[PDB]
Amino acid sequence: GILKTLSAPIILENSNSTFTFLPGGDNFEWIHESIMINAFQGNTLDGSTNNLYLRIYKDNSLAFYPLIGMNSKSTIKSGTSTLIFEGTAEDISYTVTFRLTPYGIWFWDISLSGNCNKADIIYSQDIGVGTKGSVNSNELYLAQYLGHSIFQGDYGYVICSRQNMAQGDLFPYLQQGSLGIRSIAYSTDGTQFFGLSYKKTNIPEALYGDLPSKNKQYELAHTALQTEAFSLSGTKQFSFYGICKTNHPEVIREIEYIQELEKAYAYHESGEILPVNVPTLQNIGAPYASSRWDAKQVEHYFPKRLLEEKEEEALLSFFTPEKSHVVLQDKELTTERPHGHILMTNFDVTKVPQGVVSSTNYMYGAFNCQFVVGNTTYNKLLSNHRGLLNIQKDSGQRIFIKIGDCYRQLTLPAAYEMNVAGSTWYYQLDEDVLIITSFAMYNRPEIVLKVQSLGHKKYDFIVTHQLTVGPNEYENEIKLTREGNILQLSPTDPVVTNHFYPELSFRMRIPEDCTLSDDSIFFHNNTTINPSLLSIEILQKSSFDIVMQGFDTGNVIPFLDQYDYKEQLEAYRIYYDQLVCNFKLSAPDKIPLSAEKLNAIIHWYAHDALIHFASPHGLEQSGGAAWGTRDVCQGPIEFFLTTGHFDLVRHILITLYSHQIEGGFEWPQWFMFDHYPIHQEDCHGDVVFWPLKAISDYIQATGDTSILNELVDYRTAKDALPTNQPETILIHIKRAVTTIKNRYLSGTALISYAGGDWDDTLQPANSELKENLVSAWTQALAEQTLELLCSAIKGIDHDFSKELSHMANDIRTSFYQYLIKDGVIAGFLYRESEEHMKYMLHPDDTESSIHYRLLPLTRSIIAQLADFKLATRNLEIIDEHLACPDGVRLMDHPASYSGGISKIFLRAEQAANVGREISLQYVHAHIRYIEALATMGLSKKAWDALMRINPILLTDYVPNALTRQSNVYFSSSEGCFDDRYEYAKNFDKLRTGDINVKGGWRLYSSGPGIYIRRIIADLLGIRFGHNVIHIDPVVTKELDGVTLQFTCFGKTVFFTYHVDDTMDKHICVKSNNNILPGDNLNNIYRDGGIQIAKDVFLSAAMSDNNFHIYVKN
Ligand SMILES: OC[C@H]1O[C@@H](O[C@@H]2[C@@H](O)[C@H](O)[C@@H](CO)O[C@@H]2O)[C@H](O)[C@@H](O)[C@@H]1O
Ligand SMILES: OC[C@H]1CNC[C@@H](O)[C@@H]1O
């Protein structure tokens, strides 16, 4: 069987515009010249996110009715550019006329007939305002750059929106308002309209009240307008309108296009407008959310609880001794981002993995989205999760359960339990509990769904699956075959449609007695709308399973007889223990809370880091697949070096060097690491340093200078294909170093900024800024990297090593000579020539509102480039200008924002949303601050900083932090500022904790891996070198008497810490009371740690594996 693709059957056209709808009149794709206007495509079971609601007020009730889409009771007629919806709501008769005019302008003309005392209308419209590709790739991201301006016109509120992030070359625009009726209130974000409560109730919260009339610049661009209320006795008529422009290079200052709007309003099509068939749902009800569990029920299902989070004495979340994290219903209804989880199969940890199976799931009944095998974008069976509030709830795998006469889609459970192997949902039903589990198999490319009635009661179910079989829903036809209870799914025309994985297939094992269809079973007349919705009806069962297999290379394996969760959980526990070298903190007395948070989080961060490495995607950032060049060089390499996964790092490095670009001899920004030849050949200015630093770190850790002699190819810039001109890794390095030498500004060793540094929002706004800026952060990184390379290469190429030392020293000299003034490292220097220089992000830049930058302060310290005086000053500057309760900030003031046009920096001046790097607390940079503090031996500050970004019981540690998912990494911390203007004005509230702060994007980040390295290597102080162990703790007094279990060179040992201010030496290490000999480490800021030979360490370990570490702060 060939599954066809969904095509929207209602197609409205007019000059430069194609607006399509599903048969219920739900929005599908609204396109004006290449610009997609809506944010979300409707689906055949939920409809679309937009609507028009009639509300009727009575003395004892408020009622609300959708007028459009499949949830209205509307009949529909269509012409070539017009739709007419007709129906009744109570005893009001209505018509809604949709018009698509030639002017990139549309209208919803409403007509109401009847008799009632008080009514109003709410207009509701999700908005994208980007190319179709940008919208599809990430709606949240696109929304962040969509800047809303609010005005009063003739008929109250009008909302004008400019997309600040370039779409092709264009800055597109929307305007929305009302005509013939006043819009008395407005909102601009989906969180305002639907509310968090929607995730349980399935009712938009705003429908019960008044819109707030505030512009919230967040991730769910969603315009709502509320009319003045009116009585009806007779007929009343009025319209809403929209305007789309593909390019509006200026900032928005006023209502525009008034004359065009008037011309468009006179527009009517000449053609006939004829009835069309509207399909209707059959015995399908509203969604089903579980009732909440009370304290007694929680206690019964979860008797053993740790790290309990409570708010007003109600339990929100907790951890278990089995290493699970459990989230109770009330917590999800208070987190702006939805609780979720990524499952990933195990792989051989000595090699770069391939064909790794992954799946995403979310608390609110998204049981399996984005099931993939290998490439997370292309090698996909199930559609991605989108949005935040589950308005569109048809993606991936979903479950309907028959309650009374009606199938009801499961949404919000009573509890949601995550472990590294699986997720479990607990739904309270009438006198029963339904348990759903989606879990990864060990050693097999499988995810398994199990459904179990606890009371062994029988139910009817429909399990739906929005198929892709490729990167996107609705894009390609699918080949589906069935042999008994085994389905096989694969792309049609696999060689051609997939040159690179021509054998890509999937299989599903389905229950014995089930029937198979598309969405036809949902509809009264059995009409198929979406043929790629794979529906499985399972009648009168108390349990069932669906087993899902992925094969990137067609190595099909038979299904097991029994699929047991517990066995997988046990195998994954061991794999994750080994991955972190059996890390475990203990004490004989009460373990300190900080240590208890580290034991709980270490395995969660290891999982996040391993995903970031092997299966590169996140929760919000679903579109990844590739390795970022600077990304793989940080989180994964630092994680793997810390835990002794050296063979893996070697293989990563070989793969990485194979992706260096022929000719330019830099790296791409990102590249696929599988068989897909895709990369981004244009790079930022810092990227080149990262593979150089990483190979040098690898060489220092292992002594494996052999890597330098490996013969390794390059890739071509344009088509990302192998060049078949291999050279030694040493020569790869020499070529990359030449690109660095050629960046010196003339007369100096100042490294030109080029395409930007670490901060992707700080790309230069023009070519003069690109050529003439110098990033002090980049300068410091260069110095550091070239010094590290010098050492790594010293034994192999004496001469190149001397040239590397000269470079590093000249860079060092220029750093001190040009980038420091009055003891303050400037964030940037602008140097057109010796005669025309200007500091930026420095106190001398008195024109600017920004006078301090974090990044150079931390990197200069990490590298031991900053002398003690400068390091000490750096820390005072942080304390006085950058330090907040939620961590250290990237600058002392926000980047400029003046309506979206860039002057100096690109995305930093374009983002309308206070979030991501624009939040100024980008957690990765805070982690480098921790690293800097550790380098300086400042244990109190370091451990305090470690805790400020630890999501476990975060609200207890940082009182102004809003709670968020406690078992996942959060990438940023942003003040609750609705727009950039308020953010600038009341910025200082961040320093003093007088504004709440909330978490950013989850999971996908270098953070988890570099956090793990801070914990183990820098703070606990256990680091590895060539046949040596380095012991160099930076611990507080509360770690006195605490022990770390850690596997060293394959031997489990126990490091017990003693903090002793009265010692003579800085450090002493003892086993069986014998002092271990070794040499002192080099550190310009404090007394160094100790280097102990591996044979010596291991010999002591054989007699007594309890090492006692005496350290003086
Ligand atoms: O997706 C928005 C996000 O993109 C960030 O950049 C990407 C990076 O995180 C990822 O590792 C690679 C490979 O998939 O693609 C991109 O370079 C960017 O740094 C952020 O500013 C944006 O928020
Ligand atoms: O701009 C800060 C960071 C954002 N995510 C990708 C990283 O490579 C980058 O440094």
UniProtKB/TrEMBL annotation:
Ranges where the Glycosyl hydrolase 94 catalytic domain occurs: 576-958
Which residues does the UniProt record annotate as the domain Glycoside phosphorylase C-terminal? 1021-1110
Q: Which residues bind Ca(2+)?
A: 1040
- In this chain, alpha-D-glucose 1-phosphate is annotated as bound at 630-631, 758, 760, 917, 922, 1005
User: Which keywords label this protein?
Assistant: Calcium, Glycosyltransferase, Metal-binding, Transferase
The alphabetized list of GO BP terms reads: carbohydrate metabolic process
Q: Where is the Glycoside phosphorylase super sandwich domain?
A: 302-550
Q: Name one GO molecular function term.
A: glycosyltransferase activity
Task: Return the InterPro entries for the record.
Answer: 6-hairpin_glycosidase_sf, 6hp_glycosidase-like_sf, GH94_catalytic, GH94_Enzymes, SOGP_2nd, SOGP_C, SOGP_N
Name the record gives this protein:
Uncharacterized protein
**What is the originating organism of this protein?**
Lachnoclostridium phytofermentans (strain ATCC 700394 / DSM 18823 / ISDg)
